From a paper:
Structures of complexes of PmGH with [name] and c‐di‐[name] were determined from crystal soaking experiments with both nucleotides. Crystal soaks with [name] and c‐di‐[name] gave identical structures of PmGH in complex with [name] showing that PmGH retained phosphodiesterase activity in the crystal. Based on the structure of the complex of PmGH with the final reaction product [name], which shows the 5′‐phosphate of [name] bound to the M‐H Fe pair, c‐di‐[name] hydrolysis may be catalysed by these two sites alone, with the G‐site Fe contributing to the hydrolysis rate. This would invoke primarily a two‐metal‐ion mechanism as seen for other PDEs (Barends et al., 2009; Tchigvintsev et al., 2010). In this case, the two scissile c‐di‐[name] phosphates would be sequentially hydrolysed by the M‐H Fe pair with the phosphate group which initially binds to the hydroxyl group of Y285 being brought into a similar conformation to the phosphate group bound to the M‐site Fe(III). After hydrolysis of this M‐site bound phosphate group, the hydrolysable phosphate group of 5′‐phosphoguanylyl‐(3′‐5′)‐guanosine (5′‐pGpG), the product of this first hydrolysis step, can be positioned in a similar conformation to the previously hydrolysed phosphate by a rotation around the original twofold axis of the intact c‐di‐[name]. This would then enable the conversion of the now bound 5′‐pGpG to [name].
Here we describe the first crystal structure of an enzymatically active HD‐[name] phosphodiesterase protein, PmGH from [name] EX‐H1, a thermophilic marine member of the Aquificales. PmGH comprises an HD‐[name] domain fused to a GAF domain. A remarkable feature of the structure of PmGH was the identification of a trinuclear Fe centre which is buried at the bottom of the cavity forming the c‐di‐[name] binding site.
Author numbering:
A (entry chain B): -2 to 360
B (entry chain A): 0 to 360
Write the structure that this text describes.
């Protein structure tokens, strides 16, 4: 006997998968599989629109690239421009049908149902198409109803994924640019601020931290030096080396960064605050500003020291050319258990190649 | 025609996928469950680390109701992780009948299942009540509710993740915008409020809701260029001479330099506000003397909001101007300092502004 709720449960499960998926490619793929099953069709395709190339595009297989599709030709084309549903009972009796892809692969297209996708503001953003109904000779009025509902769901989840990406990009952008507000009074570069987070990301990942904390350090670490905004010009702008009154002030950029960042409730800012205050502490206890020792420094602080020192050593600075990989590895082996967390130093050494390809790609 | 429930589900999950507010997501889920389980009532309970209780929200959008995580039906499901299927609540000792007592309701059947997160911890309870057959929840019902519960967990976790991102995004812009706190007196709240005013101004000016959200977040960053102004000027104890004032005025350019090129819309707008917020509608402002609509709307809305906050704050010898005095000032400055059209919107709404200044002092 059949389960009367069988398709309902299938749909619930697909909905859970989609709700969890941040990658648009996979969202599309899942929506396609969902349509094949619920519509009882052999094939399905979603076509979206590109502003820039003025085309529709789709994913063919799992894990391969966009196929360009003419936004004005074919069944997809008609539906995209007109906004109206097409239900073709025999594809070969229809002049809008491209017989080619069908004839290169040994496939036979009989039935096609295509409806548009709409955004919140009722504009046409693409097409949803199913091909070859399996359990009937044609797509029915009921099939059309169902596909329209599927289409509404597809539009929403598609939009929600785009928006979530835009918000994520904006969040990074803001952290990056504001962290570099020191640019008028301090030599450290925009890409240094970014790379420090990228190295610490690798480190947290390979140390087995939760996916969320991997994302956190990537974004918290870039802010480690923001307290420099509160250092007097006479100390920050001093050419060369520094006296032991001025040094006592320069050290305070840790405290100042903490002061700027502590007034959050988000986990991001609690971590960023910790990093700002901890990033010159040494595994030793011989760092500043408090000479904290070992696990007394949070893992995020420990991961940032390693990253920050790594980036410095590998750039040109006053009097000193960037160190190469070999010398860098020698230095870290030496400083393992001193300046740095010994555990975290091993992870970092295991992954030294990515550290360098980051430094190479982001100059 | 068993496709009725498929279509109901796709409608609900369309609404959910759009829904940014956790409150609403829970309401949509319980309505979904009511229709799909063919039941009269449903509730979701979530746990709180801090207060150590479960909670639930009722429709109408009232406050969250706190529930004892130890006693009760939901309590039981939360502690044990076991499913509970009660054919008659008025026979089960774990049932508290007071809810019926206040509402004029009669609870008969209760089916309650755990909610699990990605990591597989019990994060809540999904409870469905009074199946419309007036008979028990069946083994097939339990099975259906299980799939509903998985969808609910996913959507909840996904909504919480978005709120945390949203909240972090604000925190970061607010705090780093106040990075000037060591060398300049403008407060954290001033920085927040200016955005809050401009949000209302933008909405009432008819702007798109996404753009309204951008100004709320972009305007607070307009003075960030102050961090590049030399101490010998920003920290000078006298009043500034002409040479020094010209340097101070560059905080506009400096903010632009800090913010521009960032590819997102947020930062493009923020950069404009940074560089335009001292421009004056009539062209007598700085740094460029831009005139009318040569100033982006966002620039124009921030000037209005910034002046508003200044006029309405106490300083020594200088008491905050009240409503009437402030209205008069904006009337005088219409078409000079400020955009006439936007000033009218602002005036129409000035009571909302004063409420903000009252709540976030
Ligand atoms: N041992 C050593 N450390 C360096 C050198 N250049 C930069 N650093 C490190 O870089 C840290 C801060 O990084 P930066 O401020 O240059 O990004 C300093 O605490 C310091 O330990 C160097 O030539 N030798
Ligand atoms: Fe530092
Ligand atoms: Fe540094
Ligand atoms: Fe200002
Ligand atoms: Fe200003
Ligand atoms: Fe201000």
């Amino acid at each position: 006997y059949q389960d009367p709720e069988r398709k309902l449960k299938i749909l619930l499960d697909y909905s859970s998968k989609i709700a969890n998926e941040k990658d648009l490619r996979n969202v599309l793929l899942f929506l396609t599989d969902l349509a094949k099953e619920i519509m009882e069709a052999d094939r399905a395709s979603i076509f979206l629109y590109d502003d820039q190339k003025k085309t529709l595009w789709t994913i063919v297989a799992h894990g391969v690239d966009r196929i360009e599709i003419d936004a004005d030709k074919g069944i997809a084309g008609y539906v995209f421009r007109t906004g109206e549903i097409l239900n073709i009972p025999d594809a070969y009796k229809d002049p809008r049908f491209d017989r080619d892809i069908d004839k290169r692969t040994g496939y036979r297209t009989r039935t096609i149902l295509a409806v548009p996708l709409f955004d919140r503001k009722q504009n046409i953003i693409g097409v949803f198409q199913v091909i070859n109904k399996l359990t009937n000779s044609v797509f029915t009025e009921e099939d059309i109803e169902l596909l329209r509902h599927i289409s509404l769901y597809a539009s929403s989840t598609i939009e929600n994924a785009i928006l979530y990406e835009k918000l994520k990009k904006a969040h990074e952008d803001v952290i990056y640019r504001l962290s570099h507000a020191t640019k008028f009074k301090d030599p450290e570069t925009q890409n240094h601020i970014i790379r420090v987070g990228l190295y610490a990301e690798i480190l947290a990942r390979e140390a087995g931290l939760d996916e969320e904390d991997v994302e956190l350090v990537k974004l918290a670490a870039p802010m480690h030096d923001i307290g420099k905004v509160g250092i007097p010009d006479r100390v920050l702008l001093k050419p060369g080396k520094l006296n032991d009154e001025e040094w006592e002030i320069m050290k305070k950029h840790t405290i100042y960064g903490y002061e700027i960042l502590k007034g959050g409730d988000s986990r991001l800012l609690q971590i960023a605050a910790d990093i700002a205050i901890e990033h010159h502490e040494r595994w030793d206890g011989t760092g500043y500003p408090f000479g904290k020792k070992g696990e007394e420094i949070s893992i995020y602080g420990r991961m940032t020291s390693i990253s920050d020192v790594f980036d410095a050593l590998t750039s040109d600075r006053p009097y000193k050319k960037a160190w190469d990989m070999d010398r860098t590895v020698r230095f870290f082996k030496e400083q393992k258990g001193k300046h740095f967390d010994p555990f975290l130093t091993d992870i970092f050494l295991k992954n030294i190649d990515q550290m360098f390809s980051i430094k190479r790609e982001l100059r």
